[PDB]
Amino acid sequence: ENIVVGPKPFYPIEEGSAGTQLRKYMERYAKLGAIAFTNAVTGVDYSYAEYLEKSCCLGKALQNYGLVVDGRIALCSENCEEFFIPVIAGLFIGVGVAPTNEIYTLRELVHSLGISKPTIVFSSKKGLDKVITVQKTVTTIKTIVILDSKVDYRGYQCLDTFIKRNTPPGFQASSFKTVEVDRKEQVALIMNSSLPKGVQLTHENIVTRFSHARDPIYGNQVSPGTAVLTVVPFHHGFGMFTTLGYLICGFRVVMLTKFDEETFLKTLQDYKCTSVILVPTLFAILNKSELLNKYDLSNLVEIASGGAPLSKEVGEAVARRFNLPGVRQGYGLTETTSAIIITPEGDDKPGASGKVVPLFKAKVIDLDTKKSLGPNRRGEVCVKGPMLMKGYVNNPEATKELIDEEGWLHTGDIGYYDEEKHFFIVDRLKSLIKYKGYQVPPAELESVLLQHPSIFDAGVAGVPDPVAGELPGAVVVLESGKNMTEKEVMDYVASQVSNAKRLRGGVRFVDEVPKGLTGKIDGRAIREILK
Ligand SMILES: Nc1ncnc2c1ncn2[C@@H]1O[C@H](COP(=O)(O)O)[C@@H](O)[C@H]1O
The missing domain is CATH 3.40.50.980 (Rossmann fold)
Known part of the structure; x- marks a missing residue:
């Protein structure tokens, strides 16, 4: 119908279990003398x-x-x-x-x-x-x-x-x-x-990821010895499946546990990292950083992001600072193994999460009518393909609520695609702020707040209101030394957005915006701080 179909993979799914394939590749890099893992902080290598x-x-x-x-x-x-x-x-x-x-x-x-x-x-x-x-x-x-x-x-x-x-x-x-x-x-x-x-x-979910990982358009080209810097958590699918794909590719995985501006930049230089994978929080730091110029970053050819919405304006600015064409985004869920929408090599578009990966299908459904949508219409993203999970352990009920009678998984995410089939992910459905008849995405307001020179970090959620239902409020972390008032933040937002998106629910200043480990805002924590 209005279904978007991903292309055939360059490299077919190979035979064998996930372990058989992993050993096949690792054996190869082992004879080469290659290093697999480097701890950037201690400098310890594992070949x-x-x-x-x-x-x-x-x-x-x-x-x-x-x-x-x-x-x-x-x-x-x-x-x-x-x-x-x-x-x-x-x-x-x-x-x-x-x-x-x-x-x-x-x-x-x-x-x-x-x-x-x-x-x-x-x-x-x-x-x-x-x-x-x-x-x-x-x-x-x-x-x-x-x-x-x-x-x-x-x-x-x-x-x-x-x-x-x-x-x-x-x-x-x-x-x-x-x-x-x-x-x-x-x-x-x-x-x-x-x-x-x-x-x-x-094992089928995993071996499919291995095909994407080495795809020359949707992954990275095999190139043993190439160093990649990762700051993403390994226990989460973000870190699990980028890392396993790097081992398939023969990369040197440079790992940085605790983030630190100077250590981050030293590492990129000292290991001549070709690529870096980050959670969106970190972009805020890189856009403001005065240190970029004191380091040789000439080898960095790719900056990747995922896990949480990324401000298109901050992303563009960061791409500009590092002299790159754009940011490589991935989007997916734990339930779909890894990223099912990925920026294709040499097909960057500002604010896009990318395109449907090989062997997958995607559609956007109307919130009210459950009907498919054409380009440029916002709705719920649904996907289908061989990276869909087997199910939740001892939870057949929750499994059935997520994967429908036709085998489509419902992401609970709101997005849209354009005429060229680039996918834009806006925010989580459960996070939309119900101000009168409007559905206001917190990520859109977060983006505006992040463009402010005095604001280091921000998070937005709805605050209950007897008249309007929900009012958009924010928690704001200022840059050290800098100073702002509730009304100054509100006035700056008001000057940039339409009436409905105004921060009627107030602003509170905090030390830390409550977030999950991959960057997703804890809306429940923010609601409570605000009320
Ligand atoms: N590239 C992205 N852009 C916007 N949101 C994302 C992106 N990647 C992941 N997410 C969010 O993170 C969720 C999956 O994370 P998780 O629940 O930890 O498995 C998705 O449903 C989205 O809400």
């Missing part, structure tokens, strides 16, 4: 050969430990260079992996691990306290392994100890064989979005 060997050795160890196909393990860790060893090993042996982050509240962690039910938890040092407390409630956790220590830590086996205690002394990594699985049925990963539900992704 592809060491990473491959530790993943194979861990795979054997887990089998010897007694884990069968369709068993479960989890991670609870902030970004560290060892993060993917349990992930890759799990994929090699057909055991489901549930990534969580150290930054979870205990309530989130008890609920998340309560759903996935892991036999072993690979924890970082910093996460150990929280994982010990989770174990008192989620009592099916037998073992905790410390991921980022070379020696045992507080009485818990470190990763090397567990491999050593669970492989024979004569075992060579090279004698290990990956397990073939039923691809469309085998759960590979249990993901949480940014109380969490368990999103089940299969």
Whole structure:
């Protein structure tokens, strides 16, 4: 009808499980002498050969430990260079992996691990306290392994100890064989979005991502040794599936845990990074930065973003500062594995999230009538393709509400496409501010607020009102030293937008705009601050 269809992929989906394909590629970069992971802050490298060997050795160890196909393990860790060893090993042996982050509240962690039910938890040092407390409630956790220590830590086996205690002394990594699985049925990963539900992704979902990752238009060209800088969380699909695609491509993954303006720029220079992937929050910092010029950034050819709405004006300004044509955006959901809309190489358009990825379909549906829309009409984005999740763990009800009777997943996101089939993502449906008969997107007002020289960060939500239903209000973080009044912010917004978008609900100044880990505004937190 009004359906938008993505092209055929350059590279067909290869045969084999997610683990078989990963080993195939990693083996190649291993012989080359390539480095897989670099911690930018400590300067610690892991070559592809060491990473491959530790993943194979861990795979054997887990089998010897007694884990069968369709068993479960989890991670609870902030970004560290060892993060993917349990992930890759799990994929090699057909055991489901549930990534969580150290930054979870205990309530989130008890609920998340309560759903996935892991036999072993690979924890970082910093996460150990929280994982010990989770174990008192989620009592099916037998073992905790410390991921980022070379020696045992507080009485818990470190990763090397567990491999050593669970492989024979004569075992060579090279004698290990990956397990073939039923691809469309085998759960590979249990993901949480940014109380969490368990999103089940299969080996088929993942091997499709691998095809996109190496696509010359929708991914990155294979080029071993090329350094990429990432600041995105690894436990989330944003970080999970960009990173796995980088390993397929042979890239050197430069990881930066805590963001810092000077460290960020030093890193880009010192590793001659070709590309950088960011959450939208960080653009605000780069647009204001006075330091850009004191660094050699001549090698940077691509700046990528995702996770949350990106101000088209801030994005353009940042592209201009780094002398690039545009920003490469990706858009997707945890439920669709990874990005299903991606900026095509050499087809940038300011404010667009990109175009439908190979093997996917997209449509925009009217909010009222559920009917398909032509270009330039806003509505709910729906998508269909082989990266749709298997379902939520033990939640058939929520699964049915998301994927309709015709196999279309309803994103809960509002957007539109233009005459050229470029997709623009506006905001989340649940976030629209219902001011009288208007539906006002907070992202549109956030953008205006971000263009202000005195405003570092902003967030917008609706405030209840007996007359109008909802009034747009904002929380605003000023640049250090700078100073503004509630009315100054309101007057500046009023001069730029139409009547309906005015900040009738007030402005409050805060230290930190409440946000999720991938950049999405916590509208509930802002409502409360404002009221
Ligand atoms: N490029 C993007 N532009 C606007 N919103 C995005 C973009 N990418 C992801 N999102 C938002 O993040 C959501 C998926 O994140 P998550 O719930 O953590 O799986 C999407 O439904 C969108 O609301």
